[PDB]
Amino acid sequence: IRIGINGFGRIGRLVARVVLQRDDVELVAVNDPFITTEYMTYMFKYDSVHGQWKHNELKIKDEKTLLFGEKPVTVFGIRNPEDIPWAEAGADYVVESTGVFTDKDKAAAHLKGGAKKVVISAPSKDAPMFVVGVNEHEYKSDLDIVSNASCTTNCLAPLAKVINDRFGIVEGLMTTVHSITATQKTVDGPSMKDWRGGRAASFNIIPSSTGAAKAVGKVLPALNGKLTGMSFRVPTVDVSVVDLTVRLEKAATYDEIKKAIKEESEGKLKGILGYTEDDVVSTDFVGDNRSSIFDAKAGIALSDKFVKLVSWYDNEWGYSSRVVDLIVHMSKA
Amino acid sequence: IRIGINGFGRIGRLVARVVLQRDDVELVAVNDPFITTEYMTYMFKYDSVHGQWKHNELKIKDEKTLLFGEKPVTVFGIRNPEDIPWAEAGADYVVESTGVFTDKDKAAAHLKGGAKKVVISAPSKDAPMFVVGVNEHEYKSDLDIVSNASCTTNCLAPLAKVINDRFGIVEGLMTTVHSITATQKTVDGPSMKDWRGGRAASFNIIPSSTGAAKAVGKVLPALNGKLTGMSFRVPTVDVSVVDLTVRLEKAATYDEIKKAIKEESEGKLKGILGYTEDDVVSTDFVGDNRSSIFDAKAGIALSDKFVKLVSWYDNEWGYSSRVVDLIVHMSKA
Amino acid sequence: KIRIGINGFGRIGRLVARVVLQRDDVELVAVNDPFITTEYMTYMFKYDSVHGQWKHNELKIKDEKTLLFGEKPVTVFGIRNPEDIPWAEAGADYVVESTGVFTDKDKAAAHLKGGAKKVVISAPSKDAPMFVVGVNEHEYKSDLDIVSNASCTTNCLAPLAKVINDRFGIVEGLMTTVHSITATQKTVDGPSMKDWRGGRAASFNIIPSSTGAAKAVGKVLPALNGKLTGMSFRVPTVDVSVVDLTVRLEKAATYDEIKKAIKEESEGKLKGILGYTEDDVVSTDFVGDNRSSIFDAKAGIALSDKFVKLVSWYDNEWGYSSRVVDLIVHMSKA
Amino acid sequence: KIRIGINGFGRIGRLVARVVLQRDDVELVAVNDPFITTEYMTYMFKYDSVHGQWKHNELKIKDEKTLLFGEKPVTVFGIRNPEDIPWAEAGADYVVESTGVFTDKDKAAAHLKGGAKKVVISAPSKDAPMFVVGVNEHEYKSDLDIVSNASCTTNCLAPLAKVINDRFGIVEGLMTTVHSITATQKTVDGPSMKDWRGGRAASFNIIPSSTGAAKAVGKVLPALNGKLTGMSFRVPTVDVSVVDLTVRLEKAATYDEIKKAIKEESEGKLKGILGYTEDDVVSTDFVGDNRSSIFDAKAGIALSDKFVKLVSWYDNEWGYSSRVVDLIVHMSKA
Numbered sequence A, B: 001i002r003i004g005i006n007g008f009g010r011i012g013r014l015v016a017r018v019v020l021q022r023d024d025v026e027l028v029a030v031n032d033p034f035i036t037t038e039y040m041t042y043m044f045k046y047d048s049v050h051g052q053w054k055h056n057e058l059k060i061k062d063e064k065t066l067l068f069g070e071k072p073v074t075v076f077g078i079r080n081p082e083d084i085p086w087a088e089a090g091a092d093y094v095v096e097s098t099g100v101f102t103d104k105d106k107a108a109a110h111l112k113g114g115a116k117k118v119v120i121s122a123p124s125k126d127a128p129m130f131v132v133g134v135n136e137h138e139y140k141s142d143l144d145i146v147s148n149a150s151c152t153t154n155c156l157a158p159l160a161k162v163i164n165d166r167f168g169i170v171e172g173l174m175t176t177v178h179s180i181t182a183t184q185k186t187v188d189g190p191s192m193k194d195w196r197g198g199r200a201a202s203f204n205i206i207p208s209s210t211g212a213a214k215a216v217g218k219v220l221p222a223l224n225g226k227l228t229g230m231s232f233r234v235p236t237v238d239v240s241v242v243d244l245t246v247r248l249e250k251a252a253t254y255d256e257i258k259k260a261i262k263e264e265s266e267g268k269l270k271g272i273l274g275y276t277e278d279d280v281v282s283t284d285f286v287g288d289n290r291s292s293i294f295d296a297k298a299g300i301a302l303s304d305k306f307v308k309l310v311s312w313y314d315n316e317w318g319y320s321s322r323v324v325d326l327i328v329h330m331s332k333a
Numbered sequence C, D: 001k002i003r004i005g006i007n008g009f010g011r012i013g014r015l016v017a018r019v020v021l022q023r024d025d026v027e028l029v030a031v032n033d034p035f036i037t038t039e040y041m042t043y044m045f046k047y048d049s050v051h052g053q054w055k056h057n058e059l060k061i062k063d064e065k066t067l068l069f070g071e072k073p074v075t076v077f078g079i080r081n082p083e084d085i086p087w088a089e090a091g092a093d094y095v096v097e098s099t100g101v102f103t104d105k106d107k108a109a110a111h112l113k114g115g116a117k118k119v120v121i122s123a124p125s126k127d128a129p130m131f132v133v134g135v136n137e138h139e140y141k142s143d144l145d146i147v148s149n150a151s152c153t154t155n156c157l158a159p160l161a162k163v164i165n166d167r168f169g170i171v172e173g174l175m176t177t178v179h180s181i182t183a184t185q186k187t188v189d190g191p192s193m194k195d196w197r198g199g200r201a202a203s204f205n206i207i208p209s210s211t212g213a214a215k216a217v218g219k220v221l222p223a224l225n226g227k228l229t230g231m232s233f234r235v236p237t238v239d240v241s242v243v244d245l246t247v248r249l250e251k252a253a254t255y256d257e258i259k260k261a262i263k264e265e266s267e268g269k270l271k272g273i274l275g276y277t278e279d280d281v282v283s284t285d286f287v288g289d290n291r292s293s294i295f296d297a298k299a300g301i302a303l304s305d306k307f308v309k310l311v312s313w314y315d316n317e318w319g320y321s322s323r324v325v326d327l328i329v330h331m332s333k334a
């Protein structure tokens, strides 16, 4: 299980922290043209949210290798995927976490290097989409390039599946309150694709567009077309919270809904879905590695068919775990 | 129209800025035991959100009077409402904006001074509740003490009334993303009444409880029991956004909903309800004095009976305007 | 008379424009920014996170070409390359270079090829002469093809440093600045090849950052050249900074006397440039303050009467943008 | 042996407790806070915005009375008045006074009435002697009924100031601190009768704030007494501060030599107290760092070899809370 990372960013570095820590996978190659080999060293070591790394990893040679205890990782800086030699240093698995190559077409440039699989660290217009714990088994050794969906979809689908599996969802609207990301700006700046997105990120509540509810349909067909949503970017560095307003087919009191989710959190969905009854706020989930954590005391019901459910997620650390879990599930057909 | 302010806080100072600016009202008395006469001078002058004041106002005498151009305001520091002599210096109208005296019973201590009316700057368990533009006409010269509802209710009811007036609301769930307030804490501290509320305010998304949807019923009886909601406190100094997920009786496309609201914003509800199609984020509404501003591009519809609507509000400045408008409407039966 | 052009419609670009538009003695001719659509330009100008909505005007007419500011029409350019900018072809005699990427004297010169008579660089340069208004803008000479309005920080420091120097003389001085974030920073830990700490998430760190401001003062105030050095920390505020000045003086003084001295100069030659407050100010109190430097009497502290620390506030965006307009005006007369 | 009591379960209260609980050489006996319910105490201890969830333990048993920390049981008090605190009745030999409201030597003494042998004030005092670990904790003498662990800032400054002083001697020095917000500040502009700027909304202002840290150094380091003075700015970060030191030295030096000197002392007597980094650090890099002062070589700047500026990082909450525990331990031995 040799893993390469394309784009050593929030997700890429975090995914590296996760990979290097597990004993069943190994980190073979990193690519990022914008970060020099040594600089990678600094970026990996220090982190504003996740803390200084607690094991070890340094620069061995002028530009080609880092040393983690005793495992070499080679370092590339290649602007173009097709010109990444994942082959010439092993790494059957590639995490595509640049944000520019989500088109299955564009991520395939990785097959041209020596790479058996590609995992895109975002939703794709056109790549099978899997969310661990909900539809990862729909996977096949014959799918070359795949997607781990998005952090929001990963938080939503697990709650969504359980909710519909047992009470059925007539209709659903989701709102997420979400932390800022690399695509935002420190001060009002240009972002042609999304205008509300150039506004100074830590000083505004910025409405923002999210395709996750339309994505839950595409990993969970019973719900296809039955949910949609929007988002608000707000000024926290990390952690987000999903807010789902749903209409239930079968009448259910709040307490019933509560321990139906508690059960799955203990059962099939342990490690993916969590459940809490504490008075948590978002810093409480920094470093939490579940996909979704249901917040019982938070949610609210109008009537036993109409209800609002709140679930947390650490958009960076949770989603990064799931990437590794997909990859491992991949290698075991 | 002589107005006194109890508790020279965010709302009280802002309401003072609003009163002093209008020509149809006058600011007679301010009470606040925790702020000395001169200090009031400093607090009124400078403001982190609203800017330095643009007309003028200074300390005349050791502890009893401030001078605004040529109008004296007397300054009290009395811990107990019943012992405030609103009489002995005029001021028929009192804005109760301390946050400790929302009980109609407790606000009545103001009638014991020389005061014809009291306006509570918050919801009351037991005081008639009015939201300008929605039910201010249900008022009577015989109601002694009143409530201007809450900032969220003031943002919600105007959208709510229009929505139900024309398409009918079967069921509604509201979420607000809301700025932090004086009740929150800079760092994790004690708040026995609400635990998620002691967590460091500018570093968390903090779920929080709101009675506004249950309050919209109590100024708009058609909707009584047909909406509820929750809130998220987030790290912006001012401005909040209401997010309403509603189920409509009569089918309506999004565009229809849009210009049905546009119309009222131009019509009956001008100055209370606004409408925009721009890419606004919350700083865009700092200083906006409407009750509610509908954000068209933001909202979303699943189906023509199920829809999500987004409206902004400047929790401090909008609500403070409305207080003055209630008071003025009061004095004119 | 006095038509102006702006290259780089960013924070300084748009703001210098809110200024040029509010004055009578100056006109806004055209703007260039290859990264902002003509309609986007109206959105960005109109709404501002720090300085509020713009309250006079203001729309566009030409599919891509022209913006109507009230009734004045501004020509809109989306052109990468500076010499490809036909400034004159839309009579733009003065060009504000607020791009951040052409602070070189030869670099800025590309604007002249375009048919343009002067280029003011809204940022310090390695070569272009540096003038700070109220300190040495008289060295301007009509020959200077290209100029620099130096930095926000140098504008807060210099005015202040002069009064202190020209009344008690500065022997030795060290400068710290507590500065707001800027567009060069990152929302989230990200790549900053030229400055590593500067890649760290901006609104959640106190970030040591470099500044030349204390040495630039020597270049605009050759009296002081070589006697000042400093550093900065970027911190999570959207706008407004503060200068922290540690100086030793030849001429003994008290805090009261240095306080009185500053007030004097404040209404003298340096009115509107150097300000003086004795209130309990905090940084939001200075948002939209057009003065280059505001001295804060109650904040500072003294060790001796020769060893002292001096506090000056400044709105890095608005004071500086005002100053650019000022300096241009003075170059039009002289 | 070494049982400890905490008055004021706040930021310093709860954190000194995460410390006392992690060590073997010390026990946590009981806590007092009239404003926190016994069950609330577990919530507040458990979850923390800056330092994460606590990862060893930990529950309660007694309706109101007792908390189980792993298997150690802690007695919970909700009592306003210090002398009403029967500390001994629950064998608590050492009392950490982290309330903020009893920093007076006679004020702290109320704890002794309660049957308690020593009171460490987690904050500087007007009277109580001030010891800074690694600088002068040896002046402790077994007679001292009551002690002060001084301030977070004095702990960052003193260690550093000594190395500089005892190798090149400080003639004259001025200190600035860029400091994180604390519980004394306000989310929103609100009343601060004792300090007006300190009432201003904390996460949206750079706030000038006062500090005695440079003068407290003289009281713990009488070599330096009267040669340092300073100020601070509070800024929108939740934890971690940085010290800005402007000093002139009798003994000429280079930046390299002062750099080498600090490193030396860093592993010498002052290991674990004074730290030394040459990396590209920012303030989050120091969250949960238990050292009292971390010197930052790349940040600082030098004017002469007698005029220099020195940068030290510090986690005001965690370093200080570690230090309190340290000083108590040293008082148990000596």
Ligand SMILES: NC(=O)c1ccc[n+]([C@@H]2O[C@H](COP(=O)([O-])OP(=O)(O)OC[C@H]3O[C@@H](n4cnc5c(N)ncnc54)[C@H](O)[C@@H]3O)[C@@H](O)[C@H]2O)c1
Pocket: A006, A007, A008, A009, A010, A011, A012, A031, A032, A033, A034, A035, A078, A079, A080, A097, A098, A099, A100, A121, A122, A150, A151, A181, A182, A183, A315, A316, A319, C189, C190, C191
């Ligand atoms: N941050 C989150 O909460 C989060 C969560 C889920 C999914 N994602 C997804 O992950 C992807 C990256 O997100 P991020 O938050 O890490 O952003 P990021 O900006 O920190 O990472 C981008 C990285 O890619 C590198 N890069 C850019 N072009 C490259 C190229 N052609 N070759 C190699 N490297 C290149 C950059 O230097 C940078 O380090 C996006 O697709 C994003 O939607 C992010």
Ligand SMILES: NC(=O)c1ccc[n+]([C@@H]2O[C@H](COP(=O)([O-])OP(=O)(O)OC[C@H]3O[C@@H](n4cnc5c(N)ncnc54)[C@H](O)[C@@H]3O)[C@@H](O)[C@H]2O)c1
Pocket: B006, B007, B008, B009, B010, B011, B012, B031, B032, B033, B034, B035, B078, B079, B080, B097, B098, B099, B100, B121, B122, B150, B151, B181, B182, B183, B315, B316, B319, D189, D190, D191
């Ligand atoms: N800030 C908002 O967005 C907002 C919006 C709508 C309603 N309100 C309501 O307004 C009220 C106050 O809100 P705020 O945000 O201005 O808070 P705030 O803390 O700034 O104001 C409270 C003020 O009351 C003074 N005070 C306390 N006790 C007093 C007493 N007994 N006599 C006289 N003065 C006393 C205080 O010194 C303080 O100045 C609350 O009821 C709140 O729910 C606030």
Ligand SMILES: NC(=O)c1ccc[n+]([C@@H]2O[C@H](COP(=O)([O-])OP(=O)(O)OC[C@H]3O[C@@H](n4cnc5c(N)ncnc54)[C@H](O)[C@@H]3O)[C@@H](O)[C@H]2O)c1
Pocket: A189, A190, C007, C008, C009, C010, C011, C012, C013, C032, C033, C034, C035, C036, C079, C080, C081, C098, C099, C100, C101, C103, C122, C123, C124, C151, C152, C182, C183, C184, C316, C317, C320
């Ligand atoms: N923001 C401040 O506090 C401030 C203060 C004083 C000085 N300055 C200086 O001002 C300059 C710009 O600063 P800013 O803060 O406005 O930066 P900014 O990023 O906000 O603005 C730069 C603008 O330049 C545009 N741009 C980039 N490349 C261009 C090109 N080839 N042609 C035309 N436009 C281009 C960008 O689209 C952007 O709109 C820098 O040199 C900086 O040192 C900034």
Ligand SMILES: NC(=O)c1ccc[n+]([C@@H]2O[C@H](COP(=O)([O-])OP(=O)(O)OC[C@H]3O[C@@H](n4cnc5c(N)ncnc54)[C@H](O)[C@@H]3O)[C@@H](O)[C@H]2O)c1
Pocket: B189, B190, D007, D008, D009, D010, D011, D012, D013, D032, D033, D034, D035, D036, D079, D080, D081, D098, D099, D100, D101, D103, D122, D123, D124, D151, D152, D182, D183, D184, D316, D317, D320
């Ligand atoms: N937070 C810091 O960075 C820090 C660092 C160094 C020193 N200090 C010092 O520590 C002291 C406390 O600081 P803090 O930051 O933890 O403050 P804090 O407000 O967070 O904690 C004070 C605690 O004292 C409790 N309390 C108040 N009155 C009490 C009483 N009568 N009896 C028992 N408990 C009472 C409060 O409930 C609160 O839990 C102050 O003296 C401060 O100078 C704080």
